[PDB]
Amino acid sequence: MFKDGSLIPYLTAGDPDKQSTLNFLLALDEYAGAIELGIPFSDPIADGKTIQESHYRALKNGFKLREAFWIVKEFRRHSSTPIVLMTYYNPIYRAGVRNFLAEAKASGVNGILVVDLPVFHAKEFTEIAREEGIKTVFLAAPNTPDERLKVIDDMTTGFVYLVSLYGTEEIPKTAYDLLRRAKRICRNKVAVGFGVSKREHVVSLLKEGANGVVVGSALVKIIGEKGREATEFLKKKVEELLGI
């Protein structure tokens, strides 16, 4: 869904408020190949500490599901940068899969990633996303075996998202191994979320085959640190990571 060598910002919707999220997106668009907008959930057990706290902040400050669409809709007035909505299944399941996907599409969302999509529902889910015109983004971690990478690649219409809960401040070998295994199996492009925080992390991951590098934690840390005034500091971090 994005150009090779793309940096992909990840932000939690409504952290600290939907208006600020929109501001952050507009300020980082010029550096983004695509953007991941995360829907906050009460139990983000698949996320790292930093991003879990951004979920807590957003909910505490009163974030509401459809405010995420507001953000995408307003963003679309100024940009056509691909947007992937990242969420836990619970919200979608409760609101109605097709209803949510249709509403997502209508707002400008291009793809969707369901962090904990029950394998039991994967089939029907992908079929519904296809019908609603939304591309799919599936996740895989270091403990994902080659056989499953293949199944994941065959269902993916957007791009494969490789993650690493490991942390760092070096990228773990187990994370590089996941990438190395994925590029050998995936026909889809792949993005990596290995918690980069330094220029060398980006240069290296791109050199090792990542079509796109996502930047979430580095940005979110600054947001829970500077609140609405995070913007300018975010631009500098993304610039640092881009060697500019």
Q: Does a cis peptide bond (omega within 30 degrees of 0) precede residue 16?
A: yes
| Element housing 21 (H / E) | helix 18-28
Look up residue 57 and give its two tokens.
């902040």
Which residue in 36, 53, 132, 153 is the catalytic one? 36
Specify whether the CB–CB gap between 184 and 223 falls below 8 A.
no
**Paired sense of beta strands 6-12 and 35-38, if any:** parallel
Look up residue 133 and give its two tokens.
């015109």
Select from 3.20.20.70, 2.115.10.20, 3.40.50.300, 3.30.450.30 the CATH code of 1-244: 3.20.20.70
Which residue in 15, 17, 47, 67 is the catalytic one? 47
Resolution of the PDB structure in angstroms: 2.5
Look up residue 186 and give its two tokens.
């995936």
Task: Find the radius of gyration of the CA atoms of the chain.
Answer: 16
CA 37 – CA 95 distance, rounded (Å): 18
User: Number of helices and strands (H, E) in the chain?
Assistant: 11, 8
Catalytic residue list contains 36: yes
Among the listed residues 1, 9, 53, 46, the one whose alpha carbon sits nearest the alpha carbon of residue 202: 9
Look up residue 101 and give its two tokens.
């996907």
DSSP state of 39: P
Among the listed residues 110, 114, 134, the one whose alpha carbon sits nearest the alpha carbon of residue 122: 114
Identify the residue whose tokens are 């992937």. Answer: 84
User: Amino acid identity of 141?
Assistant: A
Catalytic residue list contains 47: yes
Burial class (CB in 10 A: 0-12, 13-18, 19+), 29: middle
CA 170 – CA 22 distance, rounded (Å): 31
Give, rounded to a whole angstrom, the gap between the first and last alpha carbons of the chain.
Answer: 24
Counting every residue written for the chain, the total comes to 244
Domain range list for the chain? 1-244
Alpha helices in 44-189 (DSSP H): 49-60, 67-76, 89-95, 97-107, 119-131, 146-155, 173-185
Cα–chain center distance at 118: 19
CB hemisphere CA count around 71 (13 angstroms): 30
Look up residue 98 and give its two tokens.
């097709």
Look up residue 161 and give its two tokens.
């998202």
Look up residue 126 and give its two tokens.
């992908």
